Amino acid sequence: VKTLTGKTPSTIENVKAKIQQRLIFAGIQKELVLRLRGG
Amino acid sequence: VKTLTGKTITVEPTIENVKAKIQQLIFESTLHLVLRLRGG
Amino acid sequence: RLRGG
Amino acid sequence: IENVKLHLLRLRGG
Amino acid sequence: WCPHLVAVCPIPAAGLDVTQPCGDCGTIQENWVCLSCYQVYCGRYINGHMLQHHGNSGHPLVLSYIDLSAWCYYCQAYVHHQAL
Amino acid sequence: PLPWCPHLVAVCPIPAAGLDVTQPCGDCGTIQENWVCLSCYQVYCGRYINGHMLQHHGNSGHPLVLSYIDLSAWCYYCQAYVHHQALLDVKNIAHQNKFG
Amino acid sequence: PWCPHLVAVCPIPAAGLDVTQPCGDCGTIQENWVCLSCYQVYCGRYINGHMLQHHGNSGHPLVLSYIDLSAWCYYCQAYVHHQAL
Amino acid sequence: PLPWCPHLVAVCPIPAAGLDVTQPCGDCGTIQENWVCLSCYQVYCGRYINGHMLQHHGNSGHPLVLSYIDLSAWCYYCQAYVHHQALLDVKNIAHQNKFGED
Ligand SMILES: [Zn+2]
Ligand SMILES: [Zn+2]
Ligand SMILES: [Zn+2]
Ligand SMILES: [Zn+2]
Ligand SMILES: [Zn+2]
Ligand SMILES: [Zn+2]
Ligand SMILES: [Zn+2]
Ligand SMILES: [Zn+2]
Ligand SMILES: [Zn+2]
Ligand SMILES: [Zn+2]
Ligand SMILES: [Zn+2]
Ligand SMILES: [Zn+2]
């Protein structure tokens, strides 16, 4: 998981809980924080 | 639907019914193509 | 023109 | 100055 | 990867300036750089000058000066998250 | 003249604004013999004028360019004019702007 | 019509392509393919797999069929397009 | 020297056979200053020798080439050396063939 500033096992918001109103997207997979609809 | 020889065939909208119109095999106004399952 | 671009 | 330390006559690559 | 990466041009000799304002409205909030012509314009949540640039040029790939992510206008998705 | 070349994949969609056959060269402003890049849609003169299109190819790597004089497509790598279904849209939209 | 390996493709040689070209290794004229990076002609997996062997040695991903003019990408393990000369 | 360039996408997987740091130029046979193309993996000499790689780039459009002398990567379009995560595998496999270590 990479922060908007550049800094760096099985449900949904549980991943965001560890890091919550601002979300991310990357692509389940055995492996990034954006600002949604780009451009 | 394009033949292995280069010819183009011209009736539809997951079956053998499509192959029946054209028979023993390769899988809108979109173009379908006849090949050989594993290339190279 | 025989050579394009 | 930086001669002791940009990086040694490498020039344009390729 | 996306089929529009072909449109991408080399980084200019001058490099990229993360603090560059919008070429049309001068704003410094949410700016993006075009990877084909390297012009800088604001996002859709600002005044949408890069959307307008895309409409005029057809240039598909833009890079955010906020999070360095690449958006492809045609694929309507972020392509990669590689950055300077 | 090729019926296909491996660089047709590099051709991008026509910009929303459309194509302008009378567009001058982006570098020297000339209106004689210009080409449009089919990947980034920038307009530059041909080899017989000031070669700004071939200079663009050198910098970008963009292979396919369309003549605004005769609506033909040249591939810089294949060093030949290419004629293919992929170029029908680009040639149509351009012909419509050149004639109607 | 797109895969991330089309970058490896080179221009068609000045001499052009010869659909009747035999496999460079075994000389067979049944089921041959042309490499779109180095333009060498080799047989497919069903015959003697000389093109698979070439891919292993070169890393060259895209090959074109001399039977049905289709384009296979070894990495994507799929037919990428069917545009043909 | 760039931390990223828009041409890194053109980099292909290292061939199953691997890389050979001692491979001569495919055109002139020289063993001094050779580069490997990171898209088609053909080996040709640098610009200061006979420039068969400058030629290969001209013909193919392939932007990224790796040095068999110092293991650096040059982008012909960006006209600069590029260093990035994308080039780690290529540089590793090449270093192992040149030395034995990663
Ligand atoms: Zn795209
Ligand atoms: Zn703006
Ligand atoms: Zn642009
Ligand atoms: Zn262009
Ligand atoms: Zn000009
Ligand atoms: Zn071509
Ligand atoms: Zn592929
Ligand atoms: Zn064989
Ligand atoms: Zn090959
Ligand atoms: Zn580059
Ligand atoms: Zn040489
Ligand atoms: Zn190459």
XYZ file of C-alpha atoms and ligand atoms in Angstrom:
481
model
C 0.000 0.000 0.000
C 1.443 3.374 -1.190
C 0.404 6.773 0.324
C -0.647 9.787 -1.844
C 2.663 11.459 -0.676
C 4.820 8.583 -2.047
C 5.414 6.733 1.289
C 5.133 2.888 1.565
C -4.987 -11.948 4.168
C -8.722 -12.620 3.318
C -11.817 -8.411 3.655
C -13.075 -4.992 2.397
C -12.649 -1.912 4.713
C -10.384 -4.086 6.981
C -7.415 -3.114 4.719
C -8.297 0.631 5.085
C -8.747 0.176 8.900
C -4.991 -0.632 9.384
C -3.942 2.578 7.492
C -10.548 5.968 6.544
C -12.970 8.327 4.576
C -10.445 8.567 1.611
C -10.192 5.343 -0.547
C -7.836 3.483 -3.009
C -7.768 1.045 -6.029
C -5.118 -1.403 -7.439
C -5.846 -3.302 -10.694
C -8.431 -10.396 -4.862
C -4.606 -10.910 -5.338
C -1.548 -12.039 -3.243
C 0.549 -8.827 -3.895
C -2.197 2.115 -4.310
C -3.953 5.251 -2.799
C -5.459 7.698 -5.399
C -8.264 10.412 -5.691
C -10.913 8.288 -7.792
C -11.915 9.489 -11.295
C -8.626 10.726 -12.747
C -7.959 13.389 -15.343
C -16.706 -14.990 -39.102
C -13.424 -15.401 -41.087
C -12.265 -18.723 -42.687
C -8.677 -20.064 -42.169
C -8.223 -19.418 -45.995
C -8.943 -15.656 -45.539
C -12.588 -15.692 -46.792
C -15.390 -13.816 -44.942
C -18.779 -15.386 -44.000
C -21.996 -13.355 -43.348
C -28.179 -14.770 -37.898
C -27.390 -14.636 -34.074
C -27.742 -13.232 -30.730
C -22.473 -20.090 -25.879
C -23.454 -22.769 -28.485
C -22.635 -24.912 -31.572
C -25.637 -23.242 -33.372
C -23.171 -20.542 -34.608
C -20.812 -23.276 -35.998
C -23.833 -25.122 -37.564
C -24.549 -22.224 -40.017
C -20.890 -22.213 -41.268
C -18.093 -28.311 -38.631
C -15.753 -30.637 -36.547
C -13.436 -25.716 -34.780
C -12.202 -22.293 -33.451
C -13.814 -19.710 -31.132
C -23.257 -7.065 -32.604
C -21.679 -6.428 -36.120
C -18.378 -7.781 -34.534
C -15.968 -10.178 -36.406
C -15.387 -13.843 -35.287
C -12.162 -15.707 -36.305
C -11.316 -19.416 -37.173
C -7.737 -20.487 -36.039
C -6.068 -23.491 -34.023
C -6.478 -23.428 -30.134
C -2.727 -23.264 -29.088
C -0.518 -21.099 -31.313
C 3.249 -21.163 -31.830
C 5.950 11.900 -53.605
C 7.556 8.351 -53.680
C 8.909 8.665 -50.093
C 6.340 9.532 -47.441
C 6.690 11.378 -44.148
C 34.662 19.827 -5.357
C 32.332 17.006 -6.645
C 35.431 15.482 -8.411
C 36.189 13.612 -5.120
C 32.593 12.194 -5.030
C 28.965 13.620 -11.411
C 30.175 9.980 -12.205
C 33.467 8.915 -14.014
C 34.021 10.145 -19.408
C 30.735 8.077 -19.444
C 28.914 10.475 -21.947
C 25.624 9.635 -23.906
C 24.623 5.923 -23.549
C 23.642 3.515 -26.345
C -0.348 -1.506 -19.543
C -3.001 0.015 -21.951
C -3.074 0.324 -25.766
C -2.575 4.120 -25.592
C 0.954 4.195 -24.121
C 2.100 4.523 -27.818
C 0.986 8.219 -27.722
C 3.516 9.014 -24.904
C 6.511 11.300 -25.715
C 9.973 11.700 -24.015
C 10.274 13.800 -20.782
C 11.373 17.330 -21.912
C 15.047 18.397 -21.320
C 13.736 20.946 -18.752
C 12.117 18.040 -16.781
C 8.742 18.049 -15.002
C 7.655 20.761 -12.493
C 5.247 19.322 -9.811
C 4.324 22.940 -8.831
C 3.417 24.103 -12.366
C 0.038 25.958 -12.540
C -2.814 25.244 -15.041
C -1.955 26.591 -18.492
C -5.480 28.048 -18.859
C -6.635 29.154 -15.382
C -3.382 29.480 -13.404
C -4.692 27.392 -10.452
C -2.224 25.364 -8.308
C -4.833 22.934 -6.908
C -5.029 19.390 -8.525
C -2.846 19.750 -11.671
C -1.945 17.062 -14.253
C 0.782 16.889 -16.975
C 0.011 15.546 -20.488
C 2.490 12.723 -21.378
C 2.338 13.577 -25.114
C 2.829 17.372 -25.191
C 3.821 18.003 -21.542
C 1.325 20.870 -21.038
C -0.083 21.259 -17.511
C -3.853 21.695 -16.794
C -6.272 21.191 -13.844
C -8.380 18.133 -13.007
C -12.127 17.542 -13.475
C -12.829 18.498 -9.814
C -11.210 21.886 -10.506
C -12.060 23.551 -13.905
C -11.443 20.557 -16.238
C -8.761 22.029 -18.533
C -7.036 18.634 -19.074
C -10.439 17.133 -20.036
C -10.704 20.074 -22.523
C -7.066 19.450 -23.645
C -7.883 15.762 -24.227
C -10.919 16.772 -26.282
C -8.852 19.078 -28.489
C -5.673 16.996 -28.841
C -6.821 13.394 -28.421
C -3.833 12.944 -26.037
C -4.832 9.970 -23.839
C -2.338 9.826 -20.969
C -2.017 12.306 -18.163
C 0.039 12.192 -14.927
C -1.244 13.678 -11.631
C 0.999 16.252 -9.931
C -0.678 15.260 -6.646
C -0.114 11.442 -6.424
C 1.949 10.757 -9.610
C -0.645 8.281 -11.023
C -1.324 7.924 -14.770
C -4.874 8.178 -16.127
C -5.915 7.083 -19.612
C -8.974 9.020 -20.832
C -9.985 6.290 -23.338
C -9.484 3.291 -20.992
C -11.182 5.414 -18.258
C -8.732 3.979 -15.677
C -5.355 4.501 -13.954
C -2.698 2.664 -16.000
C 0.314 2.389 -13.708
C 1.683 4.044 -10.576
C 5.380 4.578 -11.617
C 6.921 8.092 -10.958
C 9.748 10.743 -10.970
C 2.602 -0.380 -50.625
C 1.818 -2.757 -47.697
C -1.596 -4.401 -47.012
C -0.625 -4.448 -43.301
C 2.420 -3.558 -41.160
C 3.195 -4.466 -37.514
C 2.924 -0.791 -36.468
C -0.828 -0.253 -37.164
C -1.380 -1.097 -33.443
C 0.219 2.367 -32.627
C -2.662 4.217 -34.354
C -4.857 6.112 -31.814
C -8.500 7.369 -31.997
C -9.277 10.578 -33.960
C -9.430 13.491 -31.466
C -12.937 14.718 -30.400
C -12.090 18.087 -32.043
C -11.543 16.247 -35.395
C -8.851 16.692 -38.074
C -8.012 19.980 -39.901
C -6.486 19.338 -43.378
C -5.469 23.072 -43.570
C -3.501 22.965 -40.274
C 0.016 24.529 -40.517
C 3.260 22.815 -39.350
C 3.580 22.973 -35.581
C 7.281 23.958 -35.871
C 7.637 26.209 -38.964
C 4.038 27.320 -39.641
C 4.209 26.393 -43.362
C 0.976 25.336 -45.171
C 2.657 23.366 -47.967
C 2.875 19.502 -47.659
C 1.913 18.675 -44.000
C 1.291 15.284 -42.330
C -0.713 14.310 -39.159
C 0.770 11.826 -36.620
C -1.751 8.960 -36.094
C -0.609 8.383 -32.469
C -0.549 11.961 -31.005
C -2.315 13.867 -33.832
C 0.271 16.659 -34.032
C 0.728 18.290 -37.491
C 4.247 18.793 -39.077
C 5.661 19.305 -42.619
C 7.118 16.514 -44.770
C 10.709 15.618 -45.789
C 10.553 17.805 -48.941
C 9.669 20.922 -46.926
C 11.492 21.149 -43.510
C 11.079 17.565 -42.255
C 9.439 18.391 -38.969
C 7.293 15.252 -39.136
C 10.325 13.003 -39.512
C 11.963 14.985 -36.674
C 8.811 14.209 -34.602
C 9.228 10.505 -35.495
C 12.866 10.668 -34.312
C 11.839 12.171 -30.976
C 8.596 10.229 -30.307
C 9.051 6.934 -32.124
C 5.491 7.378 -33.514
C 5.484 5.245 -36.719
C 2.380 6.191 -38.713
C 1.707 9.505 -40.371
C -1.113 10.589 -42.768
C -0.602 13.057 -45.673
C -2.932 16.054 -45.746
C -2.267 16.365 -49.569
C -3.164 12.834 -50.856
C -4.498 11.134 -47.654
C -1.890 8.301 -47.827
C -0.305 6.640 -44.699
C 3.443 6.177 -44.335
C 5.157 3.909 -41.774
C 8.634 5.236 -40.934
C 9.923 1.820 -39.727
C 8.530 -0.248 -42.597
C 9.664 2.552 -44.964
C 6.469 2.106 -47.023
C 2.880 3.373 -47.535
C 0.435 1.156 -45.596
C -3.207 0.399 -46.795
C -5.420 -1.293 -44.146
C -8.917 -1.349 -42.494
C -7.355 0.329 -39.383
C -6.692 3.474 -41.487
C -10.318 3.720 -42.864
C -11.657 5.898 -39.964
C -8.631 8.340 -40.064
C -8.844 8.573 -43.885
C -12.699 9.053 -43.805
C -12.783 11.864 -41.158
C -9.851 13.536 -43.051
C -11.510 13.192 -46.505
C -14.758 14.698 -45.099
C -12.789 17.744 -43.804
C -10.883 18.003 -47.150
C -13.924 17.577 -49.467
C -17.268 17.050 -47.645
C -5.779 -6.151 -31.150
C -3.439 -5.226 -28.258
C -1.028 -6.960 -25.828
C 1.943 -5.441 -23.915
C 4.435 -7.319 -26.117
C 3.686 -5.632 -29.466
C 6.653 -3.299 -28.551
C 9.042 -6.184 -29.476
C 7.770 -6.220 -33.113
C 10.177 -5.078 -35.892
C 9.426 -3.708 -39.445
C 8.653 -6.182 -42.326
C 12.025 -6.828 -44.093
C 12.635 -5.079 -47.488
C 12.594 -8.560 -49.116
C 9.077 -9.166 -47.697
C 7.539 -12.300 -46.148
C 7.455 -15.745 -47.952
C 4.415 -17.872 -46.841
C 6.006 -20.965 -48.490
C 9.236 -20.668 -46.452
C 10.337 -23.955 -44.795
C 11.228 -24.253 -41.024
C 14.771 -22.926 -40.509
C 15.702 -25.980 -38.384
C 13.908 -29.035 -39.874
C 13.035 -27.896 -43.407
C 9.346 -28.944 -43.090
C 6.656 -27.027 -45.074
C 3.709 -28.068 -42.826
C 2.523 -25.508 -40.136
C 5.253 -22.792 -40.119
C 5.248 -19.447 -38.257
C 7.283 -16.205 -38.789
C 8.846 -14.336 -35.821
C 7.733 -10.644 -35.886
C 10.991 -9.494 -34.223
C 13.697 -11.268 -36.279
C 11.579 -12.612 -39.183
C 12.969 -16.170 -38.964
C 10.507 -18.885 -40.041
C 10.035 -21.919 -37.687
C 7.523 -24.808 -37.276
C 4.782 -24.844 -34.578
C 4.285 -26.989 -31.426
C 2.266 -29.651 -33.334
C 5.122 -30.248 -35.788
C 8.622 -29.980 -34.225
C 8.295 -26.927 -31.945
C 11.189 -25.003 -33.503
C 9.368 -21.711 -33.027
C 8.812 -22.542 -29.253
C 12.611 -23.250 -29.181
C 13.331 -19.901 -30.860
C 11.104 -18.125 -28.297
C 13.049 -19.851 -25.490
C 16.388 -18.681 -26.902
C 15.438 -15.181 -28.078
C 12.572 -14.140 -25.802
C 10.763 -12.965 -28.993
C 7.044 -12.938 -28.025
C 5.080 -12.476 -31.258
C 4.778 -14.982 -34.070
C 2.534 -14.949 -37.130
C 0.992 -18.104 -38.696
C 1.710 -18.988 -42.332
C -1.454 -21.215 -42.431
C -4.137 -18.802 -41.042
C -2.146 -15.437 -40.756
C -3.000 -15.212 -37.003
C -0.765 -13.629 -34.311
C 0.222 -15.573 -31.182
C 1.893 -14.006 -28.133
C 3.894 -16.618 -26.158
C 3.716 -14.623 -22.886
C 0.006 -13.686 -23.091
C -0.614 -17.321 -24.218
C -3.280 -16.075 -26.665
C -4.018 -14.989 -30.233
C -3.552 -11.154 -30.092
C -4.966 -10.171 -33.494
C -5.895 -11.340 -36.976
C -4.944 -8.241 -39.185
C -2.913 -9.681 -42.185
C -0.673 -9.218 -45.282
C 19.729 10.474 -14.948
C 15.929 9.739 -14.695
C 14.123 7.934 -11.808
C 11.452 6.914 -14.387
C 10.716 7.542 -18.115
C 7.519 6.904 -20.122
C 9.266 4.198 -22.207
C 9.881 1.611 -19.418
C 6.594 -0.034 -20.590
C 8.520 -1.220 -23.752
C 10.816 -3.445 -21.611
C 10.149 -7.188 -22.227
C 10.891 -10.328 -20.105
C 14.503 -11.667 -19.979
C 14.698 -14.593 -22.485
C 14.527 -18.155 -20.994
C 18.107 -18.725 -22.339
C 19.296 -15.715 -20.267
C 21.658 -12.861 -21.086
C 25.314 -13.323 -22.248
C 27.473 -10.294 -21.183
C 30.262 -11.514 -23.565
C 27.976 -11.583 -26.648
C 29.472 -9.797 -29.728
C 27.689 -7.144 -31.903
C 25.177 -8.864 -34.200
C 26.373 -6.646 -37.094
C 30.159 -6.173 -36.730
C 31.218 -8.939 -34.340
C 33.068 -6.523 -31.991
C 33.343 -7.344 -28.243
C 34.039 -3.778 -27.076
C 31.072 -1.676 -25.700
C 27.955 -3.808 -26.525
C 24.401 -3.114 -25.458
C 21.405 -5.428 -25.214
C 17.934 -4.217 -26.433
C 15.412 -4.623 -23.577
C 12.499 -5.197 -26.023
C 13.929 -7.831 -28.483
C 17.153 -8.786 -26.623
C 19.437 -8.412 -29.671
C 23.062 -7.368 -28.863
C 24.691 -4.493 -30.787
C 27.607 -2.078 -30.114
C 27.343 1.448 -28.664
C 27.652 4.833 -30.476
C 31.397 5.267 -29.695
C 32.228 1.941 -31.449
C 30.176 1.385 -34.697
C 26.699 2.336 -33.447
C 24.791 -0.760 -34.448
C 22.422 -0.279 -31.465
C 21.769 3.430 -32.588
C 20.956 1.749 -35.903
C 18.762 -0.923 -34.295
C 16.850 1.821 -32.453
C 16.421 3.683 -35.778
C 14.983 0.582 -37.440
C 12.890 -0.864 -34.599
C 11.937 2.133 -32.475
C 12.973 0.084 -29.391
C 13.777 2.743 -26.728
C 15.626 0.993 -23.893
C 19.050 -0.592 -24.112
C 21.238 -2.094 -21.283
C 25.071 -1.731 -21.210
C 27.089 -4.915 -20.971
C 30.070 -2.819 -19.628
C 28.534 -0.929 -16.627
C 24.982 -2.425 -16.519
C 23.250 0.979 -17.032
C 20.056 1.593 -19.120
C 19.725 4.350 -21.697
C 16.455 5.608 -23.244
C 17.039 6.849 -26.803
C 13.926 9.076 -26.810
C 14.463 10.650 -23.379
C 18.178 10.930 -24.276
C 19.081 9.959 -20.677
C 20.105 7.031 -18.393
C 17.036 5.626 -16.618
C 17.093 3.835 -13.193
C 13.862 2.154 -11.895
C 12.330 -1.069 -10.283
C 11.436 -2.199 -13.850
C 15.175 -2.515 -14.664
C 16.058 -4.547 -11.460
C 15.478 -8.045 -12.996
C 17.387 -7.220 -16.263
C 20.304 -5.719 -14.226
C 20.330 -8.680 -11.722
C 20.372 -11.518 -14.338
C 23.070 -9.570 -16.266
C 25.239 -8.952 -13.125
C 25.020 -12.684 -12.230
C 26.272 -13.615 -15.763
C 29.040 -10.926 -15.558
C 30.224 -11.721 -12.000
C 28.305 -14.569 -10.278
C 26.791 -12.335 -7.538
C 23.342 -10.485 -7.633
Zn -5.604 3.470 -22.729
Zn -7.454 25.039 -15.191
Zn -1.179 16.970 -24.646
Zn 3.122 11.758 -32.634
Zn 7.616 22.336 -40.634
Zn 5.304 -0.470 -39.944
Zn 1.637 -10.284 -25.249
Zn 10.997 -27.344 -37.437
Zn 12.749 -14.028 -33.491
Zn 12.140 7.256 -22.179
Zn 28.766 -3.152 -34.143
Zn 15.175 -4.302 -30.204
